[model samples]
Target: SPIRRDAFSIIEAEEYNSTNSSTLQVIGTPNNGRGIGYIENGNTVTYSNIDFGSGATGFSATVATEVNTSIQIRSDSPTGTLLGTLYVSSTGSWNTYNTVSTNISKITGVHDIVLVFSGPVNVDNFIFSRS
Candidate 1:
């Protein structure tokens, strides 16, 4: 979860589109819808607006492999006790798919979120909420 607090900063939030837009790129295919992407030449997980107080949340536009994918959050927000890592899982019809969940609590501010797949699965829906 990278955050930039300066206009001159290289990272900026633009309406939070459902596209793959992050400072970090997934090792395999990218999720669809609205996400973050690395700059034209940057290679760091940098961004703003990660502190979602129940109203801030996003997901991979689409789904990909499951067993060979994973998500990584380069969070550097307020740094409050370094709570814990965001959880991930599959969603939709059970026995067919599963979901991930991270027991996050008291989100003080914004933070960037990244998702990755383990194998090849179509992620139709991803749930993002605060504790």
Candidate 2:
């Protein structure tokens, strides 16, 4: 599966073990809660439906995490909108994770962020921003 457009970056860093969603291993380089992450699984489902034990919000750009699904946006808070999600589909699909831009002009503060996928995606890097 590939990430959606309109995102600073989206990476498939790890694997989902069970039905429950896990914290997205795709943390910032410094591992400091600085960026956002969106994901889906082999089933074409997303981690948005799962509970991350923290105040994480889910914003799907498309209807859901299906084939050719659009990017989804997630945030620690509803105010700071970075807007980015992954396009979940079959394996080795990079058609959607090309590049994207977001609108954070209205953001006022920093918020904690993390992303989880339904299954393991072989990704290495995910970076996005508003430029």
Candidate 3:
């Protein structure tokens, strides 16, 4: 089975363990509940206690940015094994989103997955599946 986790859905008020929910704001006006903006570099989001069931392969992110940026996927903690990197380029506008993906090794069982940003970018969600 595939995993598609929404950016806004995982964010919680005062959630600083994964990301600073106060600094990161979810823009639902233009994206229609699809994205989170105001994300600065070094910001990380952790998907805690998720069951991969069998396993996963590719990692993709729906993002919109004017500057070149990279999204790093890791396990357990933010500095754990690098699963993959989704490179994002200018999407013309901050509201415009594009899906960027890359092949990743098998990520199985129940664990925490972290996404770390290297540049300022607006993210909608992430999709993890066999590609």
Candidate 4:
């Protein structure tokens, strides 16, 4: 089975996940009907109780950014081992969407996963797969 998580649905643990930062909001133009937007540098989202099953070989994300940026995938905590990095480039428009993918070290069993952004970016969703 594929592991797909809606970016907006993930828990925002960062202090920046507030209205003051406007770092997290629901946008209707997203591919998933609604998505998280205004993800600035140092912002993070966490998902808990994820069962990777056999293992995951790759990570994918639907993103939009005006400049090239990277998303760090970490296990358990923000400082956890880097599972993979998803590089995203400008999609031209804030509402424009693009899919970024990268190979990741095998991730097995259940654990929390964190997505940390390197710079301003908008995210739609995440996909973790064995492929």
Candidate 5:
């Protein structure tokens, strides 16, 4: 059977099921290890088979960037359900990972998580919560 990625688990940024522009790299610490970079505006990273057991109310991502941007967390398709938006600002360096988060529309069951970026950003991992 295909892996059912638990929403509560550490969803590594480089573990995406698919992507358009962004690519993976050894981002070192703060990134927790390998990560995704080379991002551009309108780029997207998709992680499929995410199983949000009971449900989730909020989400967070460990990111690094020198430019202000936002990440659109969508469900299923690239233009699917708008779960939430995470605003990201300059963290000085790409190795300087900072966590940003926001409340999301309650979601449950299995669905693909598509991360849409408004500009360049480096991502390490993502986490979802049931609160």
Candidate 6:
């Protein structure tokens, strides 16, 4: 007698509820439309009340960077519990993108998800998957 829900959620980078510093602009080619870019080291964006449904096998993102950088997934705050980190290498240009993913600790219930960045990574969207 319980409702069924999908195991993954996708959030576009431009959909952030709050951000420390970012540039929302349009991207072309494989993926077109708006996304977030121009992030610096220690910059962060928070998405409130994300329901992970108690478990996520991995985290993935559509990202690109001309510089070496990474994205960290955390709970509640930027420095909260470290869920996982996606190690992204330079993909030639910010306009280019790749699906980057990594295994993460199981997350339960609702959380105010925070994305912590290293530097100069272009973000399109992200997803968390569960089995």
Error of 6 at 40 (Å): 0.5
In model 3, how large is the Cα lDDT of residue 53? Answer: 62
Off by over 4 Å in 1: 1-47, 54-62, 77-99, 112-127
Candidate 2's clash total is 10
lDDT for 86 in candidate 2 is 57
lDDT of 1 by residue, 1-93 (tens): 233232211222222223333443333223223332232222223344444544422222233332333443334432323333433344432
What's the CA RMSD for each of the models?
Answer: 9.5, 11.3, 4.9, 5.5, 2.3, 4.5
Query: Which 10-residue window of candidate 4 scores lowest in summed lDDT?
Result: 11-20
Q: lDDT tens digits, residues 37-73, model 4?
A: 7677887776666677878888877777789889888
Number of clashes in model 1? Answer: 43
TM-scores for all predictions: 0.33, 0.31, 0.80, 0.79, 0.90, 0.86
Query: Between 2 and 6, whose lDDT is larger?
Result: 6
Which order, best to worst by lDDT?
Answer: 5, 6, 4, 3, 1, 2
Clashes of each: 43, 10, 0, 0, 0, 0
Arrange candidates by TM-score, highest first: which order?
5, 6, 3, 4, 1, 2
Q: Write the per-residue lDDT of candidate 3 for residues 3-115, one digit (tens) a residue.
A: 33332233321222356444677566273565667878888877675556677787767778899888888887988989888888898888787777788878787667787
State the RMSD for candidate 2: 11.3
Off by over 4 Å in 3: 1-17, 20-22, 29-31
Candidate 5 structure quality by residue, lDDT tens digits, 55-109: 9999989888989899999999898999999999899987788888899999999
Q: State how far residue 130 of model 2 sits from its true place (Å).
A: 1.8
Q: What 10-residue stretch in candidate 2 is worst by lDDT?
A: 57-66
For candidate 2, the lDDT comes to 0.33
What lDDT would candidate 4 get against the real structure?
0.70
Kindly report which residue pairs in candidate 2 clash with one another. Answer: 8-127, 8-128, 8-129, 9-127, 9-128, 15-120, 24-115, 59-73, 72-84, 72-85
lDDT, candidate 2, 1-131, per-residue tens: 32222232343333212223344333242333222234445222232222223222333221121244433334543233444545555432422232322332222224333343444333334433332
